[PDB]
Symmetry: D3
Subunit: 245 residues, 6 copies
């Protein structure tokens, strides 16, 4: 009845599997999850250069989703790359996982702490806090100091580091909830919530619920003004397939 | 399967009916709506004095809801009176309608305009924008300059004034969506959305979807720190029934 | 000549005595202090639930004060519960102790540190800093980690903890003054100011001086717009005695 | 018993008379007002260049006041020139009239409007709003578009323009109080308050009450850190008389 | 001696010519301007979708510039697309034209007004104001309500509309300078500055001077932390040529 | 061809020499540096009192510079004393060294750390961060805890303390660049940049490049509104020589 395209903005199939599993686990009856990733791009997003590439990969999948007539989209990287670009191209609502996780956090706690993977991505999360208006609601931001793909390397080291950092955050930061800062951390939320007795929030699952909510409310992206469909123009070279509508 | 207590913070049964109808219209399969209002309080909330009274009325119903073992609560007045107080008392999540409407607005538009009823309540909405962190996302705030209960007087004047103000807001404000600033405007959202071809958002319906989402995510109010259950103490006089837990 | 109603929002007579003593100690010649507390409510305010109850208790006393024809009111809890509600109901000015202490602090120092009692009340103080616009003027917020009523238990432990925390704040925070974050700390200000050679500010005494100042200036709460007397309506049950005017 | 030096930062004796009259009118029993102005400087302050000159003139009088052993000081220009410099040099508290008027405004209204004299001084008032943290509390800023000294030219034109602008501000701005943006407007506050039935606030009178309040509280400028007495050094030329202490 | 790559992020050669002419007109002796545009992309940037495409086009040229060993780069669209991504990839400094124009404006005026082309791009300029921290320095933002490429259509209509809007801005906004909000407006700055007797600032010319300044200071992008070279990884498909270093 | 007056706001000839050397080292071909200091004032600026004195000393030199017909001015103290006053008096652009250093820092790094000399001057730097709008771009502010003139005492202790503090800042703060917080640190920038492999920015050299840039762009201070020449009036006593124009 409801079809939601969950887009992993990086090209890692391993991370797409983790994201897809988290999305399906919370999906309402009648909801089909279409877990996808770009055909071309970057295996993991670890900075501004990676984000710019990922943004176009998102748009390629948004185009595919709109052609399929999906009800909504999820951008499944914690930088929410190409969010507003995607909202212009898509008819159905587009929700970022950082956006969704932060939104949910303010509903269950006064302040939250972010636990992400790489230190150099903290600035990206800081920018999003300011952009979304949740800076005052964020007590602290932390990184476990590992490459993004360490969450998929099977060692369990990244997962243990997340757990330890969450425990330390709840003791030190003066926050009531944890926002997981990675699509690769998606399947950790439930176990950490049960273990630590506080909301540990995965943006993937949260974004799925936001799309479902908006669809049930009969609400989609405003095509009045800022997020209207892109102005009609000829796209050249590698970009010519992005807007056939 | 899921029971959500939707609390009208004012004592108007007429407004409770409007709020209850909007909540049931969007409720997911398996969701039961318990539309309630305080036994004692104020017929409509039109200022800070009214809000303080309404806040205690909310708590009385929160207590009743928790005794019944409901899955979540909705505070159905645009000032979200007693929101954090309710989150302390309740186990299940508590979502305000102003909170929910503003949250939804940022997901479908870059900026939104608020249309409320009385001018003196604009300051309350301004304070909430700052508190929730959506001040930059709000292009303008407007009032139709009628008493709150004019929405329930059967004349249709308030409803027409809302429509006209929404049209003018979309032309002048530089916004892409409308946030309805009253529980009494709840049943107007769908018709105005279809008519104006932009998201016109009712917080009542939005808050219901937020509660459903949080319950499906296995998330509830953090009892770690700020929103923990109230400290054990003896309440005197009229307040003695508020915390029997 | 000038009568000021100093309202302890909690029901502790012990704290009312401390607050009353601090108010009378600085009162100008011709000023009578009416130290009161609600007939029904909470013994101490330690969270949002407690604040909501205290707010209505304040209003009950505001009503009594206005009937007596007092020149002004003081809300003597560091959360300033029901401040704007009280300003609507009262004719004479209403000053919160957090408000007054913060206002005074900016007049004698570039930045101040707050020392309150319970950790879970720090968020309430943070919210007030943002609401009043003094966030940039506050270097740090601290709690001594004891129940509010520990200040009245006769052990002197809370008083010693305040002193030690003030010393540590002045060494570490980069602030020039201390704002005491409790009505129960009211009588500590003078001794700590003399001992530490910096302004240690009690909001109770400060608020009394603000009321006296406004009365001498011939200024009272604006009844134009936002803080006008509450709209005429029937209050039901426990609330029916709040607005007989 | 209490001696307060009220410093007009400009060299206009006419404005010093207006400022002195406003200060004495509200002074508590036992308070002596010492109305002064710099021996050298600028007849009126109408920009940043004028402010820089006025700041040094303030310091010259602060030095004189401290030599006389006055209990406190008032800086009686709406730009509060040399406020922090004065607080370093003086032992007793130093209160600016813009500072005091804005502080009082937030105690009697949710939002205020500023009415000053020259348009080019609006930016100075804007900067002070941000510095003091009252930007959100200011609904609008207006200028009557006349030279500062027009208030002293005997025509009554400036006074009528202030009145008309206050009436228009209360109708349009969505504010509950007026802050007078000139030391030359000081004696207009009472009449406008009575006429318009809202708080029309003069910073001169307000600052006097703030000094009296701080003295009665046993509070003075913190000499710990930022506002400590200036570091011991040799001042050359025209400045050699500024710090003989 | 100094080679600066000035990148037009859109594919319009006409706009590249305008941008190149403005860059060469102010270039210091010894400075060579390399005016370029992407081989693939969008003819004009008129929204978030266009920006995402332009960002990758910028990166393609950044790669080419770094291979050539240029001293610095300029991103010549008013949305500064891919600015931080470019700073990661490039060794020499990368300056956006919106960034440079806003920076220059604060050095010659207290507040500035922005005049851009399309209304839907105003939100992009608003976001940059917040990101760069110049929101308080911007009095107003305006659009002439024409397509971006109207500046290159030879009619002179867009140019006249810019002039008229600048005149109206200086009369109404309370600003002292104009920031031109288009790379297509680059060659209008000098004539408008001379005509209106105020700074009318072109970001293209300003950014060139910023690059020259940084090179002369011996300063380049920090490779410590956030703007370090992208993490070593395999780029697939259309993106494989972006990082051969 | 281009003459830039670089004003040391303090009276230390030793610091004037350091400032002058840094300015000449980066000056473009054809640029003459006029390194000056006030005839009367303070040997070093270490607080608000010192700043007020320095501001008038700056104006005395601005007057001299304008009489000589210089192309621009630099205010060479990290508090940028009398910046807006100087912009009113001068025809050519006036750039502060704190202003210039902060501006440059945002062009080469996401966030910067400030290293100044005396702790009591940190508040002045904090105020400038807010005024210029770079608060979010500043990760931390540090002082080496020595008198300002320790940089000129020949011991090399201050220079070593700056180096050590820069190393610690880059390890702890999460910043990519260092802003030197003293005119006395001007000649340290190049060596520290080469040693630490990050941008270590001197405001003196940066401000010189900003003046050169503005002159080449044909841009000067706006005389429309806020920064117009001071209103024509008689200056008395020591101030009578400040505005002979
Ligand atoms: O994973 C991270 O830490 C951040 C972001 N990067 C990415 O490839 N997926 C993400 O969610
Ligand atoms: O209705 C309004 O305008 C505001 C708020 N007052 C109220 O009684 N219900 C509400 O939603
Ligand atoms: O005391 C505190 O710490 C905070 C606040 N609670 C209270 O009962 N009185 C108060 O002033
Ligand atoms: O008067 C004004 O408008 C502003 C300010 N200038 C001055 O000479 N005295 C003042 O209060
Ligand atoms: O031109 C504009 O209005 C904005 C931006 N778009 C673009 O194609 N070049 C620009 O500078
Ligand atoms: O030097 C400092 O630390 C700050 C400031 N004071 C001064 O005399 N020159 C300056 O740059």
């Amino acid at each position: 009845s409801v079809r939601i395209q969950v887009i992993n903005p990086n090209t890692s199939l391993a991370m797409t599997e983790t994201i897809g599993a988290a999305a399906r686990a919370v999906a309402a009856p009648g909801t089909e999850i279409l877990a996808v990733c770009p055909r071309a791009g970057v295996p993991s997003i670890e900075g501004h250069f990676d984000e710019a590439i990922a943004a176009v990969g998102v748009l390629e999948q948004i185009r595919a989703g709109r052609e399929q007539g999906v009800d909504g989209h999820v951008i499944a990287s914690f930088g929410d790359p190409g969010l507003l670009a995607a909202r212009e191209l898509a008819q159905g609502p587009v929700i970022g996982i950082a956006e969704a996780a932060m939104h949910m956090a303010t509903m269950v706690a006064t302040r939250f702490s972010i636990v992400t993977t790489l230190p150099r991505t903290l600035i990206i999360a800081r920018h999003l806090l300011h952009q979304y208006g949740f800076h005052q609601h964020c007590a602290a931001l932390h990184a476990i100091d590992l490459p993004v793909l360490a969450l998929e390397d099977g060692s369990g080291l990244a997962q243990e580091k997340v757990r330890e950092r969450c425990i330390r955050a709840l003791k030190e930061d003066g926050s009531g909830a944890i926002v997981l800062g990675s699509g690769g951390m998606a399947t950790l939320a439930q176990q950490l919530t049960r273990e630590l007795r506080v909301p540990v929030i995965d943006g993937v699952s949260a974004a799925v619920k936001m799309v479902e909510s908006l669809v049930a409310l009969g609400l989609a992206t405003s095509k009045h003004g800022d997020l209207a469909f892109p102005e009609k123009k000829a796209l050249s070279g590698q970009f010519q397939s992005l807007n056939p509508f």
